[PDB]
Amino acid sequence: NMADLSYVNIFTRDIVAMSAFYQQVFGFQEIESIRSPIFRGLDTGKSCIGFNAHEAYELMQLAQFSETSGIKFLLNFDVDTKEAVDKLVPVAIAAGATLIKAPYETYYHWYQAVLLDPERNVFRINNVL
Amino acid sequence: ADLSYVNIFTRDIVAMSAFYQQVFGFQEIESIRSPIFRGLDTGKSCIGFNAHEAYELMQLAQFSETSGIKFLLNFDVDTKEAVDKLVPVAIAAGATLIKAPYETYYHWYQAVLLDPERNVFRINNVL
């Protein structure tokens, strides 16, 4: 491929707690080789999820956008069954997630739940019917 | 679990999907297309573009007003030169260069840009 979406990075206040949250809920393994004082990466089997500390804003000349509110993206996680979605929801909430929408079937026939992670980023636990 | 998609809430799903296709060559996923959604195949996690109606559908309306940026998409290319050549391709497609191609202390050659709707992405090469 001409270009590879190797990482989806989330700017976070606590990369250790954020990494721990996604590991706890989905079991992704950390990628120790890419670890740094301001970064944590998890292997998802596809695009990796990265967590960057706030130092990352100034480092990339993005300080002007460091004041954030609302949500503009979401991570969609697929599981093998509808039952797996029902089971993972409480696990996520116990880990610090906030339930926005209980498991339901979408117009495009996907069974999913909509939640917020500990730092209020949106993610879905989904199953393609 | 599988990170199948990373969705970006957008004002113009057509313009946005076209931008990423024009810069990286991702092919559209027809089977997931809808009046409020466009999906692109990247070889790994897909990139989705959701029109604003998606906020209400997921009961996220109270979060529709946003500020700043909280994520970025990192695209790796095969060579150092690929980074230098792709920056003008992105700008021609409508991007804004924020940080010109440079080498980090851990030897990654990259550039930071904004897509047409002010979402951040990087063109990177591991030296």
* Per-residue 3-state assignment (H helix, E strand, C coil) for B46-67: EEEEECCHHHHHCCCHHHCCCE
CB-nearest partner of A1 from B6, B43, B58:
B43
B1-127: CATH number: 3.10.180.10
A39: contact with B, CB 8 A cutoff? no
Q: How many CB atoms lie within 10 A of CB A23?
A: 15
Separation between Cα atoms, residue B114 and residue B117, nearest integer Å:
7
Q: Which residues contact B67 (CB under 8 A, 6 or more apart)?
A: A67, A68, A69, A70
Separation between Cα atoms, residue A12 and residue A14, nearest integer Å:
6
Q: To the nearest whole angstrom, how far is the Cα of B1 from the nearest Cα of chain A?
A: 5
In which residue are the tokens 């979406």 written? Answer: A5
Separation between Cα atoms, residue A40 and residue B114, nearest integer Å:
23
CB-nearest partner of A3 from B24, B58, B66:
B24
Q: What is the resolution of this structure in A?
A: 1.8
> Where are the extended beta strands (E) located within A21-65?
29-30, 39-43, 48-52
A1-129: CATH number: 3.10.180.10
Residues linked to residue A8 through DSSP beta bridges, in sequence order: A49, B73
Q: Do B69 and A62 touch (CB under 8 A)?
A: yes
Q: Which residues contact A32 (CB under 8 A, 6 or more apart)?
A: none
